Design a binder for these strands. Structure first.
Lengths: 239, 105, 105, 114
RNA sequence: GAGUCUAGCUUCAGUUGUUAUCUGAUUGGUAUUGCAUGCCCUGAGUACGUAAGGAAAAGGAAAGGUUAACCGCUAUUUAAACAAAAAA
RNA sequence: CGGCGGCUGUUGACGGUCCAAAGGUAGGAAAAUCCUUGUCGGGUAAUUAUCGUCGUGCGUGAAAGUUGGUCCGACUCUUCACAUGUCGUUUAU
RNA sequence: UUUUUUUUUUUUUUUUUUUUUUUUUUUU
């Protein structure tokens, strides 16, 4: 090429909202559908930047419609997954998670590098507020209020800047015109928690950080290490 | 009809369409006279409308269903089955003739 | 529509007179069915019908009246008629756009 | 709208059933209501007395017609009326007649508002 | 030295065609028209003419046709269907 | 086993004369042939295109294969009917 | 919600609309 044609042709051309994909629409939709399930099952995927900016559109809608907990919404959620494992995870680990998160459960990170074999850009599509995340996420709900109160109590500048905002949240005592002293008073029960229903055993489980541990040892690799397979097989040339 | 001439007009017909808008809203009426069918659309907001009356109504949930903006049941519409065709000049892929394909198989 | 005249067509005239006398439709069309045979005339009919009498009734009852009316003249199994209520005239979107010949009789 | 080689009926009671258009003052086939056109008679009744080439004016049009007041008017058929010596040949007009007719022949119609 | 808005030049066709004397306190002294198809109306049944017959100065309007612009209305086609509650 | 015609007189059955083995038979006939508009009739707002017919305008010509009842048709042409962006005049995915 | 004529509007200006270029700098 010439590198000038690109510029000459692009004059007075509108941008496309939805990025084109190789194949018929029926194929494209299938592709995106399957990639959504694969993204749900992993927690981070490595994809090209254009594609990473495209899959995030449905990545948000899936979680947005999964939290309604309605027959109608359930249908739409059903209409966007394939495998049962993704359904299970979405309905048992992600829904409880984003209980207090209004929106924006995903992000895109650019790698600023080119593929060796393709010379193409690369990016990561990782969920927000997940173990081993690239960067930490901000608090929401009562956590946010506590953060804000901390900020306020830290220094004068924070107090001044958050003065207006604090009023709405109720962190300012109207009876004395000062920041609330006790912040735990604004604690409320969240949806994620378990409502109240109202031993000397040797087989008792042991507390541990993600899931408990059994009092017995089982000779078994992790879930991700008990099923091996060759990634790729060479194809001999036929001269 | 004519303000100067003081000529009025009275039309009668059955409602066929009600275009729901803000200011450009209109209603379409259809009738027959001596076997010839006539149709006329009248805007809602017009200064010429002398009077408007209803002779017979059809109050029922069916009318309410038509008088409401419904939402898609599912996101299946994105499939776009009508686009799944075969090129005339394209390679033979199965036993499908040139044109739109079928989903039974 | 029809350039020249056409051979005598008494059944078409009888159907037009009977439908306009009993069903009092508002959008009634008729023509000869060529899909049944090109070398045959005045045997098969096809058209569109719509009358207020079909409001608040199911399709079974709607078509039962048409069949009963056709029985009185002896053209039951020779007319392919599509009928919809006036309120649901939008269902006939893709049935009016088509050409409609003008038989002389 | 209307165009050459078009078959249109007659609203008058002269006896003619239909006629073929021969000419019109248009290029893009957008014939309007009230436009003079030449017709050739194709069929006639056993008791007709119309000429071979009657001259008339478009009365009714299938295509919708826009109004000055933002309304629209539509018909189910295309019919014309014969004109002779600046007057209609017949004595009555079948069906309604639209308002968009400068000619005074519309008075013979039964319902001008319909 | 630098930012903005601009003078001059340039621009479809084409031209050089404009103002003596000067209301005595008396309602004041040229003024954005270059241009042009057909049919209808006022002027007008007037000028003209035994009769038949039948003009112009000016303006006003309904078709057809060309160029350009635009999406308020209509027609064709087509897409979208997601975050008001700090108890969330 | 190549083919088969002149003058002249009354629309003209008939009469004169030259030549020759014999002097186009019948049928078809504006033609796989003359002429790229022969008269009249049917179709269309227009038909010289095409069918029917007349048999003169030039002319073809019988086991050289002529004519053709019925049946038959990947053989020219006239004409009727449905849909149709072939179209005036071009749009959207 | 977008495009289009099959819809709508104009048929005026030409010292006008518009524009890439401040020029007393006679040897960068």
């Amino acid at each position: 090429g010439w590198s000038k044609v690109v510029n000459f042709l692009n004059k007075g051309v509108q941008r496309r909202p939805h990025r084109r994909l190789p194949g018929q629409p029926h194929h494209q939709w299938n592709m995106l559908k399957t990639q959504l399930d694969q993204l749900v099952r992993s927690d981070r995927l490595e994809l090209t930047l254009p594609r990473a900016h495209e899959l995030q559109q449905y990545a948000e809608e899936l979680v947005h419609f999964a939290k309604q907990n309605t027959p109608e919404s359930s249908l739409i959620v059903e209409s966007m997954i394939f495998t049962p494992a993704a359904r299970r995870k979405l309905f048992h680990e992600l829904c409880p998670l984003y209980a207090n998160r209004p929106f924006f459960y995903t992000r895109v990170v650019n790698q600023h590098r080119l593929r060796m074999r393709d010379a193409a850009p690369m990016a990561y599509l990782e969920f927000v507020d997940r173990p081993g995340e690239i960067r930490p996420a901000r608090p929401v709900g009562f956590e946010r209020k506590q953060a804000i109160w901390e900020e306020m109590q830290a220094t004068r500048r924070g107090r001044r800047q958050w003065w207006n905002h604090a009023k709405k949240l109720g962190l300012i005592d109207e009876e004395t015109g000062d920041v609330i002293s006790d912040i735990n008073a604004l604690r409320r029960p969240s949806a994620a928690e378990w409502e109240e229903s109202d031993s000397p055993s040797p087989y008792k489980m042991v507390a541990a950080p993600k899931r408990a541990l059994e009092p017995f040892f089982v000779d078994l690799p992790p879930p991700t290490e008990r099923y091996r397979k060759q990634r790729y097989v060479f194809k001999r040339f036929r001269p | 009809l004519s303000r100067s001439q003081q000529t009025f007009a009275t039309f009668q017909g059955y409602c066929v369409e009600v275009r729901k808008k803000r200011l450009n809203s209109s209603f379409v009426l259809r009738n027959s006279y001596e076997g010839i069918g006539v149709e006329q659309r009248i805007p809602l907001y017009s200064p010429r409308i002398i009077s408007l009356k209803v002779v017979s109504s059809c109050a029922s949930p069916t009318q309410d269903f038509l008088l409401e903006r419904h939402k898609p049941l599912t996101r299946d519409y994105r499939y776009k089955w009508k686009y799944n065709f075969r090129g005339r000049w394209s390679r033979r892929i199965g036993k499908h003739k040139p044109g739109i394909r079928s989903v039974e198989k | 529509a029809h350039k020249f005249a056409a051979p005598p067509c008494p059944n078409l005239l009888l159907l037009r007179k009977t439908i306009h006398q009993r069903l009092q439709p508002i959008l009634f069309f008729l023509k000869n069915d060529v899909t049944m045979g090109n070398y045959v005339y005045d045997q098969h009919f096809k058209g569109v019908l719509c009358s207020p009498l079909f409001e608040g009734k199911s399709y079974k009852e709607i078509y039962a009246m048409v069949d009963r009316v056709l029985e009185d003249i002896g053209l039951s199994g020779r007319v392919k008629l599509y009928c919809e209520p006036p309120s649901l005239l939008h269902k006939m979107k893709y049935h009016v756009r088509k050409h409609w010949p003008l038989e002389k009789g | 709208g209307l165009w050459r080689q078009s078959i249109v009926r007659c609203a008058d009671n002269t006896g003619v059933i239909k006629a073929c258009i021969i000419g019109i003052r248009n290029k893009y086939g957008t014939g309007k209501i009230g436009a003079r056109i030449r017709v050739s008679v194709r069929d006639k009744t056993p008791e007709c007395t119309a000429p071979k080439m009657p001259k008339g004016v478009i009365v009714r049009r299938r295509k919708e017609t826009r109004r000055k007041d933002g309304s629209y008017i539509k018909f189910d058929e295309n019919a014309f009326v014969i004109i002779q010596k600046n007057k209609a040949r017949g004595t009555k007009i079948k069906g309604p007649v639209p308002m968009e007719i400068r000619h005074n022949c519309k008075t013979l119609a039964r319902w001008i508002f319909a």
